Every structure is written in structure tokens, then in C-alpha cells.
Design a protein around this ligand. Structure first.
Ligand SMILES: [Ca+2]
Ligand SMILES: [Ca+2]
Ligand SMILES: [Ca+2]
Ligand SMILES: [Ca+2]
Ligand SMILES: [Ca+2]
Ligand SMILES: [Ca+2]
Ligand SMILES: [Ca+2]
Ligand SMILES: [Ca+2]
Ligand SMILES: [Ca+2]
Ligand SMILES: [Ca+2]
Ligand SMILES: [Ca+2]
Ligand SMILES: [Ca+2]
Lengths: 147, 151, 147, 149, 149, 147, 151, 147
């Protein structure tokens, strides 16, 4: 029994046991109890907090890559953005400030996250404000220490 | 070590690029392709089984180990999820043409037709040069059918 | 003593107790009370609902694979098909819509199953319609929620 | 990092194939073999004891652990079940020849004959290059006999 | 047997330099550039991806293997760390101009503006010929904006 | 799994395990448990005790270079100096005599370190005296055996 | 192929020498300089970075390949090891003058002063025409300092 | 790992592994575990037994020159002499007959070495007699077959 944490779009985890330490994308989604499989995105959450998309037929050695967290979410489209310089992809059109501050690896209570706009004023994303990643352009997010 | 890779765009137009490092990052690939700003471009290694694997700007990729000689770079703020002949794929542009689909499927585009398979409803044929909108609600399912008379 | 449910082609189950946690294909067929052994197919029903054929001399560790369900049916030929994208094999020439929707892992009452024909009209398979899998070609089935 | 496996067709013509992954899926094998559409092809790992094990397109298979160096890919909508010298086998094509049978049996095809054994009735001999129809009703039982002169 | 490399100063004025060794040390580069004392000069190979890599006086550097044809030498007792469009950079001189930044960024300086991005606060635009002081506390983050008319 | 000692500006070490033998500068800083990544300098500590700066996106084969020690420290500026003739860079404005004598590869108890001033008096750096490297000029240090 | 090389002595007095072979040996150089016995003379090619590389009588040296046009020949039974501004050097004569040191350092001797750097002790200034004894115990460390007023 | 033999003034070797096949003089001395670096002479021992001095900052391709032996010794002065017609330099004021006969490439047991004085009697250097190369003049040594 291989235990992996499966996260949803809100970064709530569910413990899942795998019989094969090298699952496919299908095996992860099936074990997560999600259907139809073709409607769900699966993204291994790397040790450096990077989200790496996996294909349903792509084999992935969890042990070799040191991956113990997986993200599964219903998605027909992935949105591209940056948080503290990390290239990321988000499977849901919306994302909240606390999730961002979590992706950044900071204490969400102690930091603020802004949509950084070069040359214009930055837009602060509130902890529970759902930010629309469907905006035109690649969204650039950065965390600021909350004194 | 000069590594030659074919860099494809959303239209599958290729350009040869020579790399000094056989294990480049996504950032290095986009830079070598002569594209800026780097943060506005998606890079997807085109695997030998024709699967498109997105790469991050900081993600190292051994081209020799993975047997990858083709790379896709395209301007993209969002990736669209779809299936072609059962293959899990991602497309960096809102549009994709029938010739690209049949190419992703690994068929000779002249001898095949590609359809958007609608379960329980009539299938919609995608013309070779018709720009198909992958931004439609739902995950688009495409399948290639042998075209009796190459038209 | 390992208890396993043994299914027939109609997915009617019978509990069978095994003295060996690593049986052979013959041992399963014998324990299921079917003879002659050479006229019966045995397919381990994997956790992801994939049917993996077993040989009469092939040893199979049920615990390692987490397999607790087995399908036994008389068969001189296996028919190849897909259900919601899963590579499957069926030991009988016929299969019903309710069995397909069961293989698909859906609630058969809440879903409809179609034989997907690319470019032509799709054929809906009734719950108790026995579909002839001996037709030329690989049969492709997909389940749709019944709105 | 190139893993070599021989890929056989229904007539037992082989092609060497190099894999980047020593544990490919069935899909990866068929794609690497250059066969399309993938959904129309069956893949069966040829085990060291001459057993043919069907693989799914999504089923991972450790070639090295199983000691498998030969693979069979063939266009197939149906597998036919038969026995050769007591070995449980499946053939993805409706036809099989005596030389292929004697090959599966691990005997020298020149020194042996293969018969379709019929219990209580007369046995039917399968010629080396006779293509035998496995679509006959029932499970086909084949057995090899030494061609002792 | 003459290997040509361009040597840049802090203002990006270049001088062609011929080397007898395609793998010189940092000392050899500075000496060949005609700079003294050598211990007062920093040398940073300008990589093909516009990355500036500091070299030690005793560090051997294969120019051909790295595809490096441009070199930066400048008088420096301290390197200042900053970012331009996400690239980790070091500048050996306390000052840097907008045109130099846009040059490091690989953009057409006429068609772009460069800003010092301040998260949550107002951004400071760096003029082409404004000499910006990198000695400010913190790591300086610069980002280029298209001067779309 | 590659184990490396990660040093701070005081040369206090922490063992860090890496999943990749060719990490990037970001990957090292992330694994060391330091954030934000953009505020930290990383310097591979070469076998000849030379400190080679690494970029956040610069891949570094630790095995090829035989590097098993890494220095990570928060830094907005690197200071240039010499110790026993070695071109070095220090990420912090201050450096102690014991660290210098350590960089020099000498036994700090058996040696004295001086800031060599040509033509003027040399300044001895105490083991725990924090020397200000932000002074104008390139600092030249040389170690002398304490007779 | 007449190759012209400047031959310097311990005092850095030059004499032009024409060579028939662009790849001479140390023996050939000393002979061409008009010095005998050959076995009593050291020859050190003066590299472009001002480093002095000793040559053996039988050692071939491609002047064109190494870009060397200056050669040092001097009577010597022993070479002395020293440093100037961090450069590893060898001197064939027991004595060396401050002007030669500042010349080896590549500075204008009028605008600079050269010191024997003593770690932890006071530095000893070497005058331009003071003959410095390199036979002192230890490796001598010299460093040039800008002379505020050219004296 | 590039293996080179490092010799001392007595021609005793120590195996040393190099990470770079083109080391500098510093890299050799550092790997040899000698300090301070500025107090040591390094001389590549050429295939024809010629000793070629290297600078601390001089790059030397061991493979191109076919060099696998290196001599490191503490030295502030090199002494010039000839053995069997070979122009040589010795970093230590003293040298023994066995080392000379070794430099000459002869069997030290089967040969005698003399300081050849033209017109005067030659002085024989005993195998373990330490000969003072600080004598005025260039020392001329020649090996004689010991019948
Ligand atoms: Ca702003
Ligand atoms: Ca967006
Ligand atoms: Ca879509
Ligand atoms: Ca249809
Ligand atoms: Ca069928
Ligand atoms: Ca049959
Ligand atoms: Ca700064
Ligand atoms: Ca002093
Ligand atoms: Ca300083
Ligand atoms: Ca001396
Ligand atoms: Ca005599
Ligand atoms: Ca002497």
C-alpha cells in the first residue's frame, strides 16, 4: 500500500492507497474515485512545490521523483501563471490568495499576494478572493511580508 | 555538444535550433528559439509516441535520455485539454487545425478524416485547414477515420 | 483462507474460499466448480476495473494486486472492446448495456452507454440488450449521463 | 538508455525496436512499433516459457523483471483460445500455421509434426505452412509428435 | 591559432581580443584585455542565453564548449545581484542603465521600457540613459514592457 | 538521492538530501528550506575551496565537479576578496577570521590571518572579529603560521 | 622563414635575433643569441601575459602558435622563485631591480612603487634600480602600488 | 577521476585523483594536500623523463602531453643541472645518486653516476649521498655501466 495525498483545487487533501508505486494518470484518478476519468487533470506536486501535469497513459515513479502529493481536479483547460518566479499551471479558472500563498510555500497568515503589473499598480489577491485566471495574459503573482 | 532540435509552432512549422547543452531547461529552449518574453511562451517536448509533455522554464530535460528531438514552443497564457485517437494531449493555442490533429494522430492527413466525436450525437468533421475552437466547454474528443478516396 | 467473489458473464457472483493466496488459473476454475478446466476463461478483475486474463498455469498473488473479484466464463474466444477508454476483453460473444455500464464504473440507472461510431450515428445499448461483440472491428463504448 | 525488444507479427516476422523506458505500456510498445490505429492492435508479451501474455494499452510491463525480450503485436478484434502441448495460449489472429505452433511448442519444426487432437475421433494434422482456422467452435488442442524416421 | 572574443566594459563598449588558447583562465582574459591590476577586475562570461557567469582568475573556461563569444571585464570590488525578466544576474558595477538592462533582456531598447517592479507599490521606470544605483538594499527586480503606441 | 552539506555564512552546515544529482540553483535553495528564492545566493564549494556562484536556473552536476558542499546565504550583493591568493566571493558584508582561515584551508588554531596592505601596516583579523567586506577596494587576506 | 624575436637579458636590454625556423629549440635560441657555452644559459619564453616560461635546450617551441615574440636569455646555474602582483615567476639571476619588477608587473615604473610584501610585518620598498636579493629564504612576494606623485 | 602520480624530492609517489583532466598548478598542489600553495613547485614529469616547470595559473593538458607523473616539492629556488645530456631543474638544494640514476632512466643498481668535471677528476655520487646542487656552476652528471 503506497499512500499519496490527493489534493483538489482548494488544496484540501485526501489520503489514497496505491497498489502500484508506479501508477498511471488513470490509476491515480480511478483510485481518487473520480469519474469520468477523461474529465480530470492530474498533476504530481513536486517536492519544490512545482505542479507537473501527467498524462492518463504516462507512467510516473512516485518514489524516484520523491512525489507524495498529487492534485486531481475537473478541468478541460489549464491556466498558466507565475508565483514567486515558479512556472505553474492551474486546472481551474479560479484560484484564491490562500492557495497562492500556499503554493509559494509561505505562511498564508504572514504574507500578502499581489498580481504584479509592471508599470501599473499591483492588485492584491485576498486570502479567500477567487482570482480569475481567465484574464488575458500570463498572471504574475508575488508574495509580500505582512508586517 | 551541439544538439539539434526541431522547434515547432502552433501551425507545426519547424525551425532547427542548436543547443550547447544536451540537458537544457525550458527557459534555455525558449531563449534559443529566439522568443521573448520567455514568460509568455509554453514549451512542450514532443515525445516519441507523439505525446506532448509540457516543460517548465526551470525543468531540466535530457533530450538524449528521453529520445526527444522535436520541441513545441508557442505563445500561450492557457493550455487546452483534448484527446486524439485516445491520446491525452494539451494544446497551447485556442485553435487547432484538422491537419495538425491528423498529424498529432500520426496519420497521413490526405488519407484520413478527423472528427470531433460527440457521444450519443452526430460527429462533427474537422477540415484539414479549419481552425477548431478548443475553448469549447468540455474536453474535446477527436478520432481519425480512413478517408476512402484521398480528396 | 482467501475469500474471492467469482463472477460469470452476467456478473452474478459466487463467494469462493481458497486455501492458497497465490492460486493458478486452474485452481480458481476448479474451486469455482466449473469443468472441464480447458473450456473456461479466467480474468482477474483489477481494482481499476481492468480485466487481466490469467492462464491455467499462471500464478497470481491476489493480495499483491489487491484483486478480490474474479470473472470465470466458458470461452473459446475472447472479444476485444473499449469502455470509456479502457482496454478490455470479454469471454462471451454477447455483452449487455448494464454490464458495460458496470464495467465503466458508473451507476447503470444514471447513465446511458453508446457504441461510438466515428462520423456515423451512435447506437445506444439498452441495459438488457445483449450486444454482439463478434462483429468485425474493435467495439468502442462510451457512457453518457442520462439528463 | 536504449532497451531492445524483438516485435513479432502474426507470421512471426520480427523487427528490432528500441525503447527509452524499460517498463513501457502497451500503447508505448504499439506506437514504437509504428502501428496505427493503436486501438486496433493487440500486444502480447512472449514470456520465457513461451507463454503469450496479453497486455493492455495502459498496463505497465517491466520487461527486465519478467525476462521478456520478444513481443507480439498484431491487428486483432478478437483473441482465439487454444492449447499446444498443454500450454494455455491465445492467438490474436484467426489463423495459425503448423510451423508457428511447433515454434510456440519449442520444438524443431523440421523434426516434429503437429496434430489437432480430437478425443475419441481421428486427429487432424496441421501442415507447417497450412494456415489453420482457430475460429472453429471449441478450444483447439494441438500436440506435437516426433517425426521419427 | 587565434581565438576571437568581444570584451565589454560596464558601459557595453566592446573590444575584439585574440587569444592563443581557446580555454583561457580569467587572469589570461584580463591580461589579454590589457587591464591592470588584474586583481581589481571582474570577468563574467556572457552566455548564449544572456546569462552573466563570473569567472575566477584561476578558473579555466572552454569558450567553444559553452558557445561564448562575448566577455565582460570591469573594475569591481563587489557584485550586485538583480533580476531582469526573471534572469538571475550580477553586475560588477554599482550602476546600470535602462538600455543595458533592455540589452540583457534581449529586447529592442527602442521598442521597450524597463521598470523596477515593486510588489504592491508603484513601479519605478528606468530611463535608457539613466544610470540606476544597484546598491539599494534588496535584490533589484527589473521587467520590460512593450512600448506599444 | 544525493546528500550535500549546505553551509550558511557562518559555515554552519545542514545535511540536505536531493532527488536530482543535477539540481538548479532554485532547487538547492528550495531544498535548503530558504525563501524567498530570489533573495538567496548559492555558491558551490569546489574541491580546491573556490566558491563558484550558481544561478537559480543554472544546472550543476555535483558528481562531475566533485562538489559535496554548498553555501547558501541571503544576499543582495557579493563582495570580492582574496584569501591566500584565491579569487573568492562572499555573499555577506561581514566575514570572520576563523571563516577566512577556514577558506584558506588552514587549521584556524595554528594560523593567523592578516588583511595585507601593501606598503602600510597589516591588520590582523581575529577569529571572531567580523570584518567589513563592504570597504572600498578588493580585500587581500593572507594566513601566517602562529609561531 | 626569418623570424625576428627580441632577446632580453637580466637587465631587460633587448637584441633582435632572426631565426630560420619558426619552431626553434632552446639550444638554437641561445646559439642564435651568440651565447656560449649553451649549457650555462637559461632561456625563458616571455609569454603574452608576461609570464616567464623556462625552455629546455631540446624543447621545441612554436613562437607563432604561442604568440611569443620576446625571449629571455641569461647566464644561470639556478632559478629563483617569486611572485609579482600574484604572477608565478622564475628569475635566472640572484638579483632583480625594482624597475624590472614593475616592468614584469606590466606597470609604468615611473607611476608605481613595488614592495616586498611581508605578511604581518612592514613592507619593504624596492627602488627602481636597487638590486634585490632573491636568494633570501622564502618565496618573495612583490606587489605594485600607484605612486601618487611620479618621482 | 584522473589518476596522476605525484612525486616528492625522493621520487616517492602518491596516487592522486583529479576531477579536471586539465588542471592548473594550484589544482595539482591543492589535490596533493600541500599548503601554503605559493611555497611549492610543481613540475610535470614528461614521458622523456624531462621535468617541465608549471605555473600555478598555467593550464596543462595531461592527456595531450601524455603526462601521468607530477613532481611537487617545497621550493623557493630551482637548481639547474644536466644528467646524461638532459636539461633538468631540481627544486631542492640536495639530490641523491639513486634519484639521478632514476632520472637518467637507468637501473640504479647497475650504474654509477659521476659529476663530470672537464679536465679534472670526476666526483662519483653515491646512491644515497645527498649531492649539493648549490655549488657554483651548472652540475653535469653522467651515468656509467657498473661491471
Ligand atoms: Ca506595481
Ligand atoms: Ca491567465
Ligand atoms: Ca476544451
Ligand atoms: Ca457518433
Ligand atoms: Ca468485436
Ligand atoms: Ca477456437
Ligand atoms: Ca541591489
Ligand atoms: Ca604589510
Ligand atoms: Ca571589498
Ligand atoms: Ca627566493
Ligand atoms: Ca674527468
Ligand atoms: Ca648548481
Amino acid at each position: 500500500r503506497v499512500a499519496v495525498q490527493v489534493f483538489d483545487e482548494n488544496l484540501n487533501a485526501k489520503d489514497v492507497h496505491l497498489t502500484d508505486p508506479v501508477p498511471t494518470g488513470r490509476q491515480i484518478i480511478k483510485a481518487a474515485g473520480k469519474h469520468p476519468v477523461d474529465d480530470y487533470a492530474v498533476l504530481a506536486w513536486m517536492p519544490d512545490n512545482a505542479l507537473r501535469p501527467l498524462h492518463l497513459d504516462e507512467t510516473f515513479d512516485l518514489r524516484q521523483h520523491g512525489v507524495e502529493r498529487i492534485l486531481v481536479a475537473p478541468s478541460d483547460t489549464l491556466y498558466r501563471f507565475f508565483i514567486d518566479g515558479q512556472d505553474q499551471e492551474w486546472p481551474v479558472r479560479g484560484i484564491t490568495g490562500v492557495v497562492l500563498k500556499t503554493l509559494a510555500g509561505v505562511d498564508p497568515a504572514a504574507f500578502e499576494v499581489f498580481l504584479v503589473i509592471p508599470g501599473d499598480d499591483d492588485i492584491r489577491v485576498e486570502d479567500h478572493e477567487l482570482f480569475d485566471l481567465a484574464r488575458k495574459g500570463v498572471e504574475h503573482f508575488q508574495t509580500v511580508k505582512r508586517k
